[PDB]
Amino acid sequence: SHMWIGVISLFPEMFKAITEFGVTGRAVKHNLLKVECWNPRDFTFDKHKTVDDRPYGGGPGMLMMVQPLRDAIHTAKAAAGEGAKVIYLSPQGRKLDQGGVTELAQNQKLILVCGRYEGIDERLIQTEIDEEWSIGDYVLTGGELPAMTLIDAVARFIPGVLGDGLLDCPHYTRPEVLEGLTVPPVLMSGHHEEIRKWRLKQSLQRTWLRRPELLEGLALTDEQRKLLKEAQAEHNS
Amino acid sequence: SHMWIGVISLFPEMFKAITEFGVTGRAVKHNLLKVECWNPRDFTFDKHKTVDDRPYGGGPGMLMMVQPLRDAIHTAKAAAGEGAKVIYLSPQGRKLDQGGVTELAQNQKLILVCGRYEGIDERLIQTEIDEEWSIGDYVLTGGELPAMTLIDAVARFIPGVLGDGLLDCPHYTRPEVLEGLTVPPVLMSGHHEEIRKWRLKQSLQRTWLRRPELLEGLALTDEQRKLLKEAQAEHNS
Ligand SMILES: NC(=O)c1cnc(NC2CCCC2)nc1N
Ligand SMILES: NC(=O)c1cnc(NC2CCCC2)nc1N
């Protein structure tokens, strides 16, 4: 079950960063993920291929020009056929987290609209956009990095692309001693069950110390409650 | 006051997405922003230029190999000279928001370490990394998009690169009527003070409706309290 993602962007070449490299580049080459871009600049008709326009009411910056952007979106929708969810990325959208990613990854087709300048006309959001998503509470120069971020996150859910609420456990590889710091002996033990439990305990400890609010949203298993209690007692010596 | 950002990455060509395009591409061309990449692959010595390694304790995936990555980091640090803050990007880090961006943007030099595979050896975090940052609570195939995201966000603070706690107001441009939806008349009025207040009221309304938790962190001005009260009364008819 592959995924098709239409992208509307003034800078489609930025998307080479995900389509030509690494796990996502492989997903594209192997036709697990298809990324197709439309550039509003190609839908302009004036001699200087104008893609921005002045905001009503005045203001510092420009907005994306409506007609080229609208026509690009319509073209992507026509290419997508039925059932594509159209998403605009901005700080005003639903904040993305891994539950949100798993929801988005249920769609076979997405169209991602990337804002530039100061953004896009509100009526295009009303008339063309199904959902608005943010990758986090910060401001960027464009929606392309947010679109790529979203693409990379959902691509991990496509079968073939790759080989629980808590932060990751610490990881160790060679050498056994690095600037005087040794690998925890349990990881050398070959005791699979002890190693599982140690990793889970470490994730519980690190989530508690760094992101305690994330624990509040979980229904811990008996085992997790036990390991967390242990980590907390060790922390309190 | 420009910014230098060292990047450690197995896929330095991904960074063309920010160094060759748009506002950030211009910042680079004009020497406001300098982005310099070191690839651990160039610091390998074996015939197959191996950059991953098996985790102690077992597990599904691989980690980044310590020696090539450590040597790349040391080389970037030597290039940076004194006062560079070294950052590793991962979901285990401090979650980035715009206050975090403004803090990071105070550094003249940053080195950004991009994780691949299942991550990096914990002792490298202990010995080489000053700070750990996340761009949000979701999992990606690599730290490069997070590094670019961070770079784009802080670049906005560099003088020359560009031309308050609340979500943005709606924006409008031509045409005056779009699929039957008209521009709010206040924006056509030319009344600058009325336009300012309308925009601020809209931001307060949209923050309240979509992200009410963001309001809790603000000390609203008398004017903002008034406009928010108005928006809330209109909402309740
Ligand atoms: N946190 C985010 O998701 C995000 C941040 N900044 C922007 N900037 C664009 C949108 C308007 C003009 C440029 N887009 C995003 N999707
Ligand atoms: N939310 C984030 O910031 C983020 C997410 N995923 C990753 N994946 C890398 C890190 C370990 C191997 C791949 N890095 C990040 N910085």
Side-chain angles (χ1 to χ4, degrees), chain B residues 1-46 48-81 83-107 109-190 192-193 195-196 198-225 227-228 230-237:
Chain B
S1 75
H2 61 291
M3 195 162 193
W4 177 94
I5 299 173
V7 167
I8 312 302
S9 175
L10 292 172
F11 299 104
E13 285 165 275
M14 294 178 66
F15 290 79
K16 290 178 181 185
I18 56 172
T19 63
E20 296 183 351
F21 303 97
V23 172
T24 52
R26 173 182 180 278
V28 172
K29 171 71 169 173
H30 292 193
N31 306 311
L32 301 181
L33 169 59
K34 189 170 179 302
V35 176
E36 193 160 355
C37 301
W38 284 270
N39 186 342
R41 187 170 191 263
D42 298 330
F43 298 80
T44 58
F45 294 103
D46 67 314
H48 291 101
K49 297 195 164 74
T50 303
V51 291
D52 61 347
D53 199 356
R54 302 176 79 194
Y56 283 114
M62 301 284 282
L63 296 167
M64 301 180 83
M65 184 182 178
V66 158
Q67 172 268 312
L69 169 62
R70 179 176 190 261
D71 289 350
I73 289 169
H74 286 179
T75 303
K77 283 175 187 204
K85 169 165 295 179
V86 185
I87 290 174
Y88 175 55
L89 300 137
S90 82
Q92 282 72 58
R94 168 173 169 184
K95 184 151 58 167
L96 188 65
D97 57 24
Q98 193 69 9
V101 167
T102 75
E103 284 169 50
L104 289 167
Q106 304 312 306
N107 297 287
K109 307 167 181 170
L110 292 177
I111 296 171
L112 308 179
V113 177
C114 303
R116 282 270 162 175
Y117 314 109
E118 300 315 316
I120 72 178
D121 191 282
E122 183 72 9
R123 299 161 295 177
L124 287 178
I125 293 173
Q126 294 172 257
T127 59
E128 301 290 341
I129 302 303
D130 296 309
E131 303 180 357
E132 202 162 2
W133 286 82
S134 169
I135 61 149
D137 292 331
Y138 40 78
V139 181
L140 308 171
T141 63
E144 283 81 5
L145 287 171
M148 280 189 275
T149 294
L150 186 170
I151 290 168
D152 180 288
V154 301
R156 297 183 63 260
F157 285 78
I158 296 164
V161 163
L162 299 180
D164 72 336
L166 303 172
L167 303 189
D168 205 7
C169 58
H171 302 295
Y172 297 86
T173 186
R174 303 184 293 166
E176 176 169 357
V177 187
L178 185 61
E179 299 208 9
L181 301 178
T182 58
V183 177
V186 64
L187 303 180
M188 317 288 224
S189 74
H192 295 272
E193 177 69 5
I195 293 173
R196 185 188 63 89
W198 179 91
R199 292 183 166 153
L200 172 56
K201 181 172 188 176
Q202 288 285 311
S203 282
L204 290 159
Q205 182 171 89
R206 281 144 65 86
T207 307
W208 173 57
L209 294 175
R210 311 188 183 189
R211 302 290 305 275
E213 80 278 12
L214 293 179
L215 284 176
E216 309 293 338
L218 301 176
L220 299 179
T221 69
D222 287 1
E223 171 178 60
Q224 290 166 343
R225 298 188 292 105
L227 297 174
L228 177 60
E230 293 183 4
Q232 289 173 337
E234 302 172 16
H235 192 77
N236 297 343
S237 312

Side-chain angles (χ1 to χ4, degrees), chain A residues 53-54 56 58 70 98 121-123 135 137-139 141 152 168 171-175 179 199 211, chain B residues 53-54 56 58 70 98 121-123 135 137-139 141 152 171-175 179 199 211:
Chain A
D53 199 356
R54 302 176 79 194
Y56 283 114
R70 179 176 190 261
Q98 193 69 9
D121 191 282
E122 183 72 9
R123 299 161 295 177
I135 61 149
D137 292 331
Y138 40 78
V139 181
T141 63
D152 180 288
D168 205 7
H171 302 295
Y172 297 86
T173 186
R174 303 184 293 166
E179 300 208 9
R199 292 183 166 153
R211 302 290 305 275
Chain B
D53 199 356
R54 302 176 79 194
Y56 283 114
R70 179 176 190 261
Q98 193 69 9
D121 191 282
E122 183 72 9
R123 299 161 295 177
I135 61 149
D137 292 331
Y138 40 78
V139 181
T141 63
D152 180 288
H171 302 295
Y172 297 86
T173 186
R174 303 184 293 166
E179 299 208 9
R199 292 183 166 153
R211 302 290 305 275

